[PDB]
């Protein structure tokens, strides 16, 4: 009439790589190993040595009564690709489960500061069917790749992997037995910063030269020259917008680069207005407001002013 | 003989991956189906959990687990873990993870 204590499960996760970020779906691929270790029923093994049971032989041991609880990735999108898997069965009842996995995982990702964004890649683990009165996680160890030089890396890892063990309490479990609606959850977090070198030298810098060069229209001598050249500048930003889009990640919001593109449109458009205004302002026909046309310094400073905010 | 009443719960984790031309989208979540079947014996006459590959073994021996079809799913959905909770009084709670294109 005395209940049995929960089965403690020690977990070790080995992360090989985090890649394949899909900005729109807020997913990312993770390749690694997962190790889970608990103590079950004592059993006989050949020569009383630890026994190794690999892959499809595991299901034969399950059919004959070996207990192997299903551990689910809470935030995995779809069924993960499982490679080799292994059971090490000890005589004293210990079981060690080791498996290779590759899966797509989901997370909350904010790319508004792109290309200077920071992300938190997480894996959440939880038993699929056994609550924390039957099965609980006792500890979680995480191991990651030893980086040599991160210069060629898309992401720069910062800090050691963070981990949590916590209880998830569900309000919609049919049966309502006292303290039978909580599950043990492992959470691992990997913090990283994007390597912005490629986006700084190939995207932001040329766009600054294109926008700056557009301010040279105010150094042309005739109104007709200032107007027709602006359209070449307008066409140069459109050309650059297409070059941007075809390479930058799709997002439901504008990034830093997207706002620079917008700022170039406004500047060029504002210059077209200023050019026309100065040439027709006086409404007399000799509209030659050279003083305002001498805003070759005031227009870039007005731009830089609006951008600071 | 009356019809079996099935209580269904659907948890939706994510809706993403809209395909505009094909008018489809992806949904990740769980589907829980409860219903009362025939009384049966279970270990210690307690609720019994059966997971994944062991579910099939139970069907062969007589357990009734009806297939619930997603009418508007595109191709076979990606079913992850699935589970049965079997009660001695006949209750069955089927629970399964799914990812599908709808």
């Amino acid at each position, epitope marked *: 009439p005395v209940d049995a204590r929960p089965v403690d499960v020690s977990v070790s996760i080995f992360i090989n790589k985090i890649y394949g970020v899909n900005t729109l779906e807020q997913t990312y691929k993770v390749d690694g190993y997962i190790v889970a270790q608990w103590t079950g029923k004592p059993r006989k093994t050949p020569g009383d040595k630890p026994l190794i049971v690999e892959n499809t032989q595991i299901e034969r041991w399950i059919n004959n009564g070996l207990w192997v609880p299903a551990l689910e990735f809470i935030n995995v999108v779809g069924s993960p690709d499982t490679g080799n898997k292994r059971l090490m069965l000890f005589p004293d009842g210990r079981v060690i489960y080791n498996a290779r996995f590759l899966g797509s995982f989901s997370n909350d*990702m904010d790319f508004r500061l792109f290309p200077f964004d920071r992300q*938190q890649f*997480v894996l959440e683990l939880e038993p699929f069917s056994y609550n924390n009165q039957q099965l609980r996680f006792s500890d979680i160890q995480v191991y990651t790749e030893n980086i040599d030089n991160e210069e060629i890396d898309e992401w720069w890892i910062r800090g050691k992997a963070s981990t949590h063990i*916590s*209880d998830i309490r*569900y309000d919609h479990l049919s049966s309502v037995q006292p303290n039978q609606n*909580e599950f043990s*959850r492992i959470t691992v977090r990997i913090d990283a910063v994007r390597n912005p070198s490629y986006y700084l030298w190939s995207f932001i810098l040329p766009l600054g030269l294109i926008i700056a060069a557009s301010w040279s229209v105010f150094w042309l001598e005739s109104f007709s020259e200032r107007l027709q050249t602006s359209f070449t500048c307008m066409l140069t930003v459109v050309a650059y917008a297409f070059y941007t889009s075809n390479i930058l990640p799709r997002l439901p919001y504008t990034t830093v680069i997207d706002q620079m593109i917008i700022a170039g449109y406004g500047s060029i458009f504002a210059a077209i207005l200023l050019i026309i205004f100065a040439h027709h302002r006086q409404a007399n026909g000799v509209e030659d407001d050279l003083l305002i046309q001498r805003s070759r310094l005031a227009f870039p400073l007005g731009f830089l002013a609006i951008g600071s905010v | 003989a009356r019809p079996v009443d099935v209580s269904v719960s659907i*948890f939706i984790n994510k809706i993403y991956g809209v395909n505009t031309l094909e008018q489809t989208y992806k949904v990740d979540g769980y589907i829980v189906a409860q219903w009362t079947g025939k009384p049966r014996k279970t270990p210690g006459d307690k609720p019994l959990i059966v997971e994944n590959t062991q579910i099939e073994r139970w069907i062969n021996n007589g357990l009734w687990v009806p297939a619930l079809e997603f009418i508007n799913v595109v191709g076979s959905p990606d079913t992850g873990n699935k589970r049965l909770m079997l009660f001695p009084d006949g209750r069955v709670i089927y629970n399964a993870r799914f990812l599908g294109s709808f």
Partner: nanobody
Framework: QLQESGGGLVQAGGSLRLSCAAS????????MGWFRQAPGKEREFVAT????????VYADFVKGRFTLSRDNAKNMVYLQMNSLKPEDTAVYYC?????????????????WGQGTQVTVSS
């Protein structure tokens, strides 16, 4: 701006009902989470809402003693604490999630209130 309340001194095994009042630009109460910090020790996670509806995330030391409830209309959340123990003595803060993806990480919370002291004696 966040403001806690409900603290107080209590004997071992007693109860309290912390309350957090939200005022300003918070879309809903799903963002608020309870934390605590004892003298010397670092601020640690206690409770907040889970990702999927009906679920709530509790720290491993809760052990079913505490419950998180909310009143989206009044923009408040309550932490009903029971079976309190001397180890639960600390300043209980109320924070608001900003971003990232770690409901349990204090690094991703801000707008902390002044806190409320909880004292359990024998």
């Amino acid at each position: 701006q966040l403001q806690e309340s409900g603290g107080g001194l209590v004997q071992a095994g007693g109860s309290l009902r912390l309350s957090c009042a939200a005022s300003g630009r918070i879309f809903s109460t799903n963002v608020m989470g309870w934390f605590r910090q004892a003298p010397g020790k670092e601020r640690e996670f206690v409770a907040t809402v889970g990702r999927i509806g009906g679920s709530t995330v509790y720290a491993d030391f809760v052990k079913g003693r505490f419950t998180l409830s909310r009143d989206n209309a009044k923009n408040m959340v309550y932490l009903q604490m029971n079976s309190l123990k001397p180890e639960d003595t600390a300043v209980y803060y109320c924070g608001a999630r900003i971003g990232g993806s770690d409901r349990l990480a204090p690094e991703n919370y801000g707008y902390w209130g002044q806190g409320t002291q909880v004292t359990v004696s024998s």
